Design a protein around this ligand. Structure first.
Ligand SMILES: Nc1ncnc2c1ncn2[C@@H]1O[C@H](COP(=O)(O)OS(=O)(=O)O)[C@@H](O)[C@H]1O
Ligand SMILES: Nc1ncnc2c1ncn2[C@@H]1O[C@H](COP(=O)(O)OS(=O)(=O)O)[C@@H](O)[C@H]1O
Ligand SMILES: OC[C@H]1O[C@@H](O)[C@H](O)[C@@H](O)[C@@H]1O
Ligand SMILES: OC[C@H]1O[C@@H](O)[C@H](O)[C@@H](O)[C@@H]1O
Ligand SMILES: [K+]
Ligand SMILES: [K+]
Lengths: 391, 390
């Protein structure tokens, strides 16, 4: 299957930069720039750039782009612009996008359309609650959206010591080919890997071997774009994942660790389709989904913002995902008798303790060990080190 | 095909008997209008009130998926109080009752959470509780129940308008009787002015010029729940009758019928439902204009929806392959022509826009609208209506 990168070809790049120095310019945020990276590398194939109004409408109402054939696309990738910049750029079909003093892309054949923020947040998140940190960022953005074709001058790098893990979809396909994979199964995650997560990955590996695949390769794919203020930062999460692999909870020989560049929306069953389709583009034939994917507590009511079973049900159902098989799972929890993470069975409610992020964070803050079997000790050590660094 | 949910007349006595002995759930008038919608096949291929899986398909994809892709963009669900859910959750089957009467049996029932904020957000693109239908959803029970619906008999209202409440199959039969070779539908909730008439007349003209010999207009006023300040159904039926009597629309090539669905006022989401239901009734052409199924935002008083979105969305919506969308832009009063005409931007100063507000003013003042805006006998029906409000 095809991957549509948006980079300027290597020969024409001197010419294109020269052109870019002469164009009107538009400042974009760090969030916008992460979306530029997403688009540039082909994760949103077949988009040619930021969404035009027609593509936006298709995504909002149908969770699929339609024009080149039905392919899943459930979140808008759009560029908000202030009314002042919109007026400034009237009649300008092409202009450069800039961040941090650097020109990063040319946007051609621009189309401005009204940023209807309430409707956008309602349809994407199922709420307009301003305490939701990503919704908060949408509401504070400009009153216009600009769609158009994007020519990205070069790969977006962040010079944080992690660029070597920011593999493109083409690079992930090539790496899987070099490992002689006959099945690629992806695990999206935003959190540290505990042994419930590992249980999902090892059970998926087991089932792929039983089907007759000989070299299934795990794509352990932590998300690395914007995340909310309280979460464990990307660099610490990468150290924690490396510790899980060093402990052998996951096998480094059959695993690729890479960073998925998308911002996190925390939009549950809407977002999990984007997490899946982007991995599909990168060549994953199988996609793991568990309970409450891409969810968070409602900031007002503190209840689950989404029904925790909806992500898997929707994803197993979703159109435009024909080259990836969904592997859904139910809740993993701590089995007290086995001293191991296990699949929860209501029929045996008394045998399990559910994993509370709040309680686990309290343990890590105080340096207390979790129950035996919850997380590999060197990875837990990464987390207690992290919380000590904040004092 | 059409999937009606009625008990076969040969098995009715058995089923009625069973219904007499089952636990019972009292439903609202709005619920009963949804029972009518379901029972007659407007939401084919649904077997009843939506189960959670169908609800999720509709909210996220605007299509039902299991028997092939077919457009379905609004939930048709039955809300249930926490108390009634606790009372019935140990029951696989029970009766739906309204006004002391047993109207249906719900079989293989499944209760799931009514997550109201998410439902209203995804269907309407807002949770504004001043929106009157959203208000009704917010005040309903905390559970939804889905299941297979067995409807004992046709839902009749016995108000003197049941003769217009045709089922999809009855609409196909009438079109057969009229020897139609094309059926084009006009959904509406408002009185017919000559802009609406222009959309229908222009559609007829274009079908004639494409070689259709007997195009039949389905003038299909919605007749389920509507908001308080709309013109009531009975007045609208008299107003439409007067439009046909004046010849503005031709009665010999027109079917006037009442579409039983409640009105959501959910704009581009709802217009797909207005379209797919007419597709089920055999319309192969569907007219859509500006701001279909829209309303002013109750809070900000702007348009709740972008007025071009309904036609743009409908024109590319999936699961509508057996109906051709015919979109139109704004029709407004051309002063120089003294007639309704398609609006022209370069030409802006020649167009007069006559809102319901200015019609209220015109009737209050004992005045008529400019010549050409509405057929005189139909405007007269409206002045009777406004007068009846004292
Ligand atoms: N205890 C659990 N049991 C089952 N699945 C889980 C559990 N915790 C997390 N998951 C799943 O594990 C994957 C990653 O979870 P997170 O990193 O927390 O968040 S997510 O945003 O990436 O989804 C998702 O598929 C999610 O549903
Ligand atoms: N002035 C107008 N010009 C063009 N289309 C119109 C106009 N007014 C209404 N419409 C369209 O006429 C049809 C019926 O409109 P209404 O009865 O007002 O409301 S609706 O809810 O049924 O859509 C819809 O297709 C709507 O878009
Ligand atoms: O997920 C990548 C990064 O996004 C940032 O906005 C968050 O503040 C960090 O905690 C996180 O590492
Ligand atoms: O549309 C049918 C009826 O619905 C009711 O809710 C409204 O109050 C009536 O005015 C309307 O005629
Ligand atoms: K602005
Ligand atoms: K309740």
């Amino acid at each position: 299957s095809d991957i549509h990168e948006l980079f300027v070809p290597e020969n024409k790049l001197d010419h294109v930069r020269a052109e870019a120095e002469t164009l009107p310019s538009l400042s974009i945020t760090k969030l916008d720039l992460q979306w530029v990276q997403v688009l540039s590398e082909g994760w949103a194939t077949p988009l040619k750039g930021f969404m035009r109004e027609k593509e936006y409408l298709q995504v909002m109402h149908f969770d699929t782009l339609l024009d080149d054939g039905v392919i899943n696309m459930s979140i808008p990738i759009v560029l908000p612009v202030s009314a002042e910049d919109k007026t400034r750029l009237e009649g300008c079909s092409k202009f450069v996008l800039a961040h941090g003093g650097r020109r990063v892309a040319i946007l051609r054949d621009a189309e401005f359309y009204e940023h209807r923020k309430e409707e956008r947040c309602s349809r994407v998140w199922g709420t307009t609650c301003t305490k939701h940190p990503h919704i908060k960022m949408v509401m504070e953005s400009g009153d216009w959206l600009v769609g158009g074709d994007l020519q990205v001058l070069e790969k977006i790098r962040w010079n944080d010591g992690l660029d070597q893990y920011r593999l493109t979809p083409l690079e992930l396909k090539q790496k899987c080919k070099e490992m002689n994979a006959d099945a690629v199964f992806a695990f999206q995650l935003r959190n540290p890997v505990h042994n419930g997560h590992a249980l999902l990955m090892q059970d998926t590996r087991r089932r792929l071997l039983e089907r007759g695949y000989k070299h299934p390769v795990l794509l352990l794919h932590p998300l690395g774009g914007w995340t909310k203020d309280d979460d464990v930062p990307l660099d610490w999460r990468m150290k924690q994942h490396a510790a899980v692999l060093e402990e052998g909870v996951l096998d480094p020989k059959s695993t690729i660790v890479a960073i998925f560049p998308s911002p996190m929306l925390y939009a549950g069953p809407t977002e999990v389709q984007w997490h899946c389709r982007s991995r599909m583009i990168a060549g994953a034939n199988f996609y793991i989904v568990g309970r409450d994917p891409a969810g968070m507590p409602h900031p007002e009511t503190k209840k689950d913002l989404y029904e925790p079973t909806h992500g898997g049900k929707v994803l197993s159902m979703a159109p435009g995902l024909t080259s990836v098989e969904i592997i859904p799972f139910r809740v993993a929890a701590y089995n007290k008798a086995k001293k191991a993470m296990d699949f929860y069975d209501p029929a045996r409610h008394n045998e399990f303790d559910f994993i509370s992020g709040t309680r686990m964070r309290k343990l890590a803050r105080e340096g207390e060990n979790p129950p035996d079997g919850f997380m590999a000790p060197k990875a837990w050590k990464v987390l207690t080190d992290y919380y000590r660094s904040l004092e």
